[PDB]
Every structure is written in structure tokens, then in C-alpha cells.
Design a protein around this ligand. Structure first.
Ligand SMILES: [Zn+2]
Lengths: 416, 197
DNA sequence: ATTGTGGGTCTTGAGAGCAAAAACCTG
DNA sequence: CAGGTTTTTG
RNA sequence: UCGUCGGUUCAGCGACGAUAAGCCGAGAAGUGCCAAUAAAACUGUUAAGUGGUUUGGUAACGCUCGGUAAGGUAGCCAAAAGGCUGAAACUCCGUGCACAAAGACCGCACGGACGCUUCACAUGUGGAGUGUGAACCUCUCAAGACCCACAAU
């Protein structure tokens, strides 16, 4: 069962004003951040105390005898419930579980100095367990989300009689997902309430879980942004980057202009040390990040779509860990990890295995005659093989090599 | 006002033993920073219910607790390390209490602190700049069988050459320095801090 | 522009996306 | 009692 | 040329705002100003003398939370309360269900038409999907590299 996330905008609260709802959400964010940081602090104190106790006695101290709880999370919840009373107890417990699991999974790295102790930021999503969220469709078409955002003392304090109700804009693909949720086809997992600061919009990120030979070869080409070549079929596919190069030129010109202007004196901008002199740059940076995210969605969707189109039950692609060294591709400084992760999870939805191979002389090797030559590549675009005189686009030959099963091992054998 | 000079070779001894000494001192400095953070956390009363009088401040208590375990480090270097950790904790205490930033942490490849008294630089007629460093304490001298002032050859060029010449002339006054290691370049460096008018 | 130092961000990775029993409120 | 709703802990 | 709204990201379209790369408000760890020299390390028989620079209170240049322009909306009855009617956002028509200022309303359902883009069959017919087009697992934390200020050059 896979887990996916869809966000639905909260347009208004029911029986509460927006001032009260905003104050409640800001406060709950404050206790969420407090709980995360203090749970991490308690995990760290327990680590240090256990080390000292092992030094003194030669064995690990049992938390049940000392803390009173069999796990650090119980003691953390016991300590936090006093100062995070406003948060619903289930939400608080899951937030503390997040913090303590993050600390525990990475304890060795922090102990040997590889990793720092995690620290959590102010704009932290409001956690909501599956039981604390319900959604109902009204007869007139509105979708109402009932959320247990408050505890009994907090409900008494702000005089909130029952679960806080909001109207969620459920449209488009969100409408299909929400209808599947209400039908019971989708099951809702631990979700969040986040705040997009650009549009000043509160979103309910509902996380839902659900039950979802021939090999494709993907090559990050030099003249073509992405290129797909298939085994057992001469079918060819590609993704050019005219939109990428045009967008790249525009955002490059804008960053240069913004950075040049930032040195010139500004009254209101320069008055505040940070978050001012930085907002205009952050806006354009977030625009670039969103464009790269959307482009990677389109690319991974196209790739998987052609995978089902030609029945390719396996997808092979270059392990970029080594490619990072050369970094000379059509896409300059692209979010290759994002694109690769998108391809992986979308293929896994489609039912297609994804395998990463070493980019070991895949471009130099000839996919037809199996001949590896350093000087085989002739020109910046074409590829000509002498052993059989094979003339093809370099991206096509690279992707054809990538599509070959066990091609990295075969290339390693041919090298030696 | 800091400049970095990389060391090609230790003058007194070989690279293997010098690197072993340097990584031992790195381990001791990291342990000192972590223990000083723990003791500053206990000192402020932030400790829990399940978890020491006699010292005026946390720095002295931490030093007198740690100096037994970190016997290899020079005592001044240990004091500088512990002061760094306690300064970080005193700077972040309010955020720690409010649950804003969790706990301060220090990287494995931690700089080796060196007080102003443990750094000297001189110039041989051969043209090799020699840096004399007091890295170890007396029990460490007995155990490792090495002299107090370890001499290392430092390449000094360009702006670094100007800075080192100003240090030698007396215009630039040396201060607390660090010995760091860069894994990407796999080289040991000295960050020398200098002050002037 | 190039080495560093003191403060902030990209691109890579990793982990996650709880469950059960009991007391309180409610019916 | 009955059933959700929090709360607390493994 | 850049943004805002029209559900989410990137484009288009409609209507709008730009001095927003703009202006402004309060609190506060850095930085500065007062006292104030605490750890710790040395030389030295000790003494003594050095480097080292701590603890509180202030301000606010820098710092932390913020604010600030941006689609359009039909009126009566009733002493009043309340009632009736039913306006306005990305195709049109009909019905039904909603709704009197509003960060919160302009919507939804069904049927028909029109347009689009996919398949099947012999330009045409049938079937499918959708109303600007394409997509629509994210969050958190760390690591390595990048950005700003400083010293030498
Ligand atoms: Zn060939």
C-alpha cells in the first residue's frame, strides 16, 4: 500500500471567525514546535545519562526503572503535556513520536559526530492523526472537514463546543481523491495543516494510503534534456528543453538584476536586517523551485506513460552519484534527485520496477557492436562507431546502452 | 581576521604519527565539547527530575570534570574548548528553554583549539616557514615520547605571505588559532587569527 | 578573483505517513 | 448502559 | 516588465495593482555604551607579575514577529426583529438544491447543446473522457555544496 498526499484549501471555519481560527492555528504551531524540540532535548538527555550510567555500572539503564516509561516517548509526552495542553493529545503524541523516532533512527550518527542534533523550525505543519480528521459532503455540494485540533482544556478555554469544522475546496483531481476517500477506497493516514505564505492559504494536506523482460533506458542527453530508448523495439522518445532554456535565461537575468540592485541603498528594505533584502530573491527562488518541480512531474509522467505504452516492465536509468562529477548536460544544475524520485514512485504506482545502473562509458560504448572507445564520440551531437560504422544521435546510443540488461557489468567486463 | 595555511609535513616527526596525534586530539576536543554542553545543561537547572556546588561558574566545573578524561590535550586548549561550548550554551539557553532550537552539537571533524600561548611562527633561512604548536600536556609527552612544541612546515604565499611577514615583524599579533582538517582536499590546515590596529 | 572567518540559502538522501487500552463525555 | 472522544502509554 | 484573484504547481485568458526590487509598526539574542574584571593557563622557591575576558543593566544602526494595492456582486417588506427575492469568477441553455457584503457569496447536482482530444470501424459513424492547456505524494530533518558581511591580496 502506497501513501500519497493531496492538499485541499481551507476557505473558512464553521462557527468561528478567521481571527480566532488563525490565532488557534498559530498557537498550535507554537506548541507543535515546542513539543518537537523538547522531545529531542529529552532524547538527548537520556542518551547522555545512559552513557554515564554505562560508564558507572557497565550496563544500559532501563528507562522503565528510571524514567517510569518503557520508552523515551512516554516520558517525553508526560513532560510535554503540561506545557502543550492546547494541542490535542493524539496530535501531541504523534508529534513527539516524530521527534523521538527521528532522534533514535540517527543516534549513532549524532554520537560519532556525523550528524547534528535535529532542530525544528517555526512554520511547522500542524499534525493530525487519522482519527482527528473526518470529511463529509453536504447536500448542496460543500465539503466539511471536522478536525480535533484542541484538547478539552483548550476547548473550554476558547469555548469551542465540538470538533472545529472548516470548508475545504474539493475540486479537480482533489475531488476524485476525496470522493474515493469518502467511498472508503482510500484510507486517510496522519495528515497535516500547513500554511502557504505566498497565497496566505491554509491547506489540509491529507495523506492517503491505497493499494496500487522489456526494459526502458533513459539518458540525460547533452542536446536533448531527456531521451528514452527501448529494447526489442526501435521506438524512440525524447524531451527537449526549450521551455527550460527560455525560463533559465529569464531567471538568470532576474537574479543578476536583483543581486545588483540589492547592493544599492534602500530605506525600508535595508531597515530590517533579515527577511528584508531577502524577500524579492526568495520569491524568484521559490518560483524556480516550483517550475522545476512541475517540469519534473511532467517528465516523469511522460516517461512512465511511454513505459506502459510499450509494455516495458522495467526502467533503467543512470545512477547520478557518479554523474555529479561531470555535470555537463542539457539541464544545467537540475534537480536530478527530484526527477529520479518522481520517476521511481510513479513507476511503482504503474507497477514497473526501477533499476539504477552505473553511467560507466554508456555514451562511449556502441549499443550495436558493443565496442567501447574513448574517442568513439565524434562531434557534440552525433555518434559514429568505426567497428561497424554506426551513425546515430549520441543520446539515442546512450539510452540504448542503458536499456541493455546488466549493461554496467558488461561494460566493466569489456574494460578489463 | 583569520588566514588558513596548509601544512605539507611535520618537521619533528613523520606524517603518520603526527596524524595519529592530531586525530587523538580531535577526539578529545569533541568529547570535551559534548561533555561541556552536558554540564552546562545540568548547571542551568534544565536537567530532568531523574537527573554541582563548589564552583563559581559552569566553565570551571566543566573543566575540572573533563580534565581527567582529556589528559592528552594541553590544559589551555582544553579550557578554550570548554569555554567555546559553554559560550554556545549561554548564547542559546533561552531558545533551549523555550523549546526553539533543541541542543547545540559539534561536528566530528572539529577544529583543534590553540590558545595564543601555544602558537609561534618563525622563518628558516632555507625559506620554510615553521610553526611551533603546543598540542599536548605532560602526561601526553611521557606517553607519546614527543617534545612540547611540535614544529610543522607551512606553505606561505601571496596574501598569506604578507600576513605571516606582518606577524613576524610584530605588526600583526597572533591570537587563538585552530587546526582543522579538510576531507575533500584531505589536508591539515592551521587557521591563524591575527589582530592589529 | 582567491584563500580563509563570521551569519544565511540550493541539490542529495532518509524517514515517515502509530496503535491499543482506558477514562470522560455524552445519548 | 452506549458510543464516540480524549488521554496516556507501548 | 512584475504581481493579485479566478481550487493546488507551470503556462494561457478575463478583470485589476504596482514607487511593492515600495513604504511603514512594535519587541528583542547579536553590535554599540556603562559599570565589571569571573574561569583557566603560565613565568616565578613562594610572593608577585602577565596574557586571558566574565557578570548585570542599557539602547536599536544592524535583528524577531508583523502590517500594508490588486476580480465582481440583485433590493424591497416589516416599528424592529425577522421575512421574501435571488446578483456576481475560465462556453451556453433548462430544472432543482443553496445563498443579503463578503478572508467566509459568486457554488453544486442532473439533463441537453456546442467545442476539444483519444480510441475503434467504413472524410464519415460509433464509443470514451473533459470544459483554457499540462501535471498534481508531500512534509520534516540533516549532509555536501552555494548566498551575504569581514581581513590579506
Ligand atoms: Zn558499432
Amino acid at each position: 500500500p502506497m501513501i500519497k498526499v493531496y492538499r485541499y484549501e481551507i476557505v473558512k471555519p464553521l462557527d468561528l471567525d478567521w481571527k480566532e481560527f488563525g490565532t488557534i492555528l498559530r498557537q498550535l504551531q507554537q506548541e507543535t514546535r515546542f513539543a518537537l524540540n523538547k522531545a529531542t532535548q529529552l532524547a538527548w538527555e537520556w542518551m547522555g545519562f545512559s552513557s554515564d550510567y554505562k560508564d558507572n555500572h557497565g550496563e544500559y539503564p532501563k528507562s522503565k526503572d528510571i524514567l517510569g516509561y518503557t520508552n523515551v516517548h512516554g516520558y517525553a509526552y508526560h513532560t510535554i503535556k503540561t506545557k502543550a495542553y492546547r494541542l490535542n493529545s493524539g496530535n501531541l503524541s504523534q508529534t513527539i513520536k516524530r521527534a523521538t523516532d527521528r532522534f533514535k533512527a540517527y543516534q549513532k550518527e549524532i554520537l560519532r559526530g556525523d550528524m547534528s542534533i535535529p532542530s525544528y523550525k517555526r512554520d511547522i505543519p500542524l499534525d493530525l492523526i487519522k482519527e482527528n480528521i473526518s470529511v463529509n459532503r453536504m447536500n448542496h455540494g460543500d465539503y466539511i472537514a471536522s478536525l480535533s485540533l484542541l484538547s478539552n482544556p483548550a476547548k473550554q478555554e476558547m469555548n469551542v463546543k465540538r470538533k472545529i469544522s472548516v470548508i475545504i475546496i474539493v475540486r479537480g483531481a482533489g475531488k476524485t481523491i476525496m470522493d474515493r476517500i469518502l467511498s472508503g477506497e482510500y484510507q486517510v493516514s496522519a495528515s497535516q495543516i500547513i500554511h502557504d505564505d505566498r497565497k496566505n492559504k491554509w491547506y489540509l494536506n491529507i495523506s492517503y494510503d491505497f493499494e496500487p523482460n522489456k526494459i526502458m533506458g533513459i539518458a540525460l542527453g547533452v542536446a536533448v534534456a531527456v531521451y528514452m530508448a527501448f529494447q526489442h523495439t526501435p521506438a524512440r522518445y525524447k524531451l527537449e528543453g526549450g521551455e527550460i532554456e527560455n525560463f533559465r535565461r529569464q531567471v538568470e537575468s532576474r537574479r543578476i538584476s536583483m543581486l545588483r540592485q540589492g547592493k544599492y541603498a534602500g530605506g525600508a528594505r535595508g531597515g530590517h536586517g533579515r527577511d528584508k533584502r531577502i524577500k524579492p530573491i526568495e520569491q524568484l527562488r521559490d518560483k524556480i523551485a516550483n517550475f522545476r518541480d512541475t517540469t519534473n512531474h511532467r517528465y516523469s509522467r511522460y516517461i512512465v506513460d511511454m513505459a506502459i505504452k510499450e509494455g516495458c516492465g522495467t526502467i533503467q536509468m543512470e545512477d547520478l552519484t557518479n554523474i555529479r562529477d561531470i555535470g555537463s548536460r542539457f539541464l544545467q544544475n537540475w534537480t536530478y534527485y527530484d526527477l529520479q524520485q518522481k520517476i521511481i514512485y510513479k513507476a511503482e504506482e504503474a507497477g514497473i520496477k526501477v533499476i539504477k545502473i552505473d553511467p560507466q562509458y554508456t555514451s562511449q560504448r556502441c549499443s550495436e557492436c558493443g565496442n567501447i572507445d574513448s574517442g568513439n564520440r565524434i562531434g557534440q551531437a552525433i555518434f559514429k562507431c568505426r567497428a561497424c560504422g554506426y551513425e546515430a544521435n549520441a543520446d539515442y546510443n546512450a539510452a540504448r546502452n542503458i536499456a541493455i540488461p546488466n549493461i554496467d557489468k558488461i561494460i566493466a567486463e569489456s574494460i578489463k | 581576521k583569520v588566514y588558513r595555511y596548509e601544512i605539507v609535513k611535520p618537521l619533528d616527526l613523520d606524517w603518520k604519527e603526527f596524524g595519529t596525534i592530531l586525530r587523538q586530539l580531535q577526539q578529545e576536543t569533541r568529547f570535551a565539547l559534548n561533555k561541556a554542553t552536558q554540564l552546562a545543561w545540568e548547571w542551568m537547572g534544565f536537567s530532568s527530575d531523574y537527573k554541582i556546588l563548589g564552583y563559581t561558574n559552569v566553565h570551571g566545573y566543566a573543566y575540572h570534570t573533563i580534565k581527567t578524561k582529556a589528559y592528552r590535550l594541553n590544559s589551555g586548549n582544553l579550557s578554550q574548548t570548554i569555554k567555546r561550548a559553554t559560550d554556545r550554551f549561554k548564547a542559546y539557553q533561552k531558545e533551549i528553554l523555550r523549546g526553539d532550537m533543541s541542543i547545540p552539537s559539534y561536528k566530528r571533524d572539529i577544529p583543534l583549539d590553540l590558545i595564543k600561548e601555544n602558537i609561534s611562527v618563525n622563518r628558516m633561512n632555507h625559506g620554510d616557514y615553521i610553526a611551533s604548536l603546543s598540542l599536548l600536556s605532560n602526561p601526553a609527552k611521557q606517553e607519546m615520547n614527543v617534545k612540547r612544541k611540535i614544529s610543522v612546515i607551512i606553505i606561505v604565499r601571496g596574501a598569506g605571505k604578507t600576513i605571516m611577514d606582518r606577524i613576524l615583524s610584530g605588526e600583526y599579533q597572533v591570537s587563538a588559532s585552530q587546526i582543522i582538517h579538510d576531507d575533500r582536499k584531505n589536508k591539515w590546515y592551521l587557521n591563524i587569527s591575527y589582530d592589529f590596529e
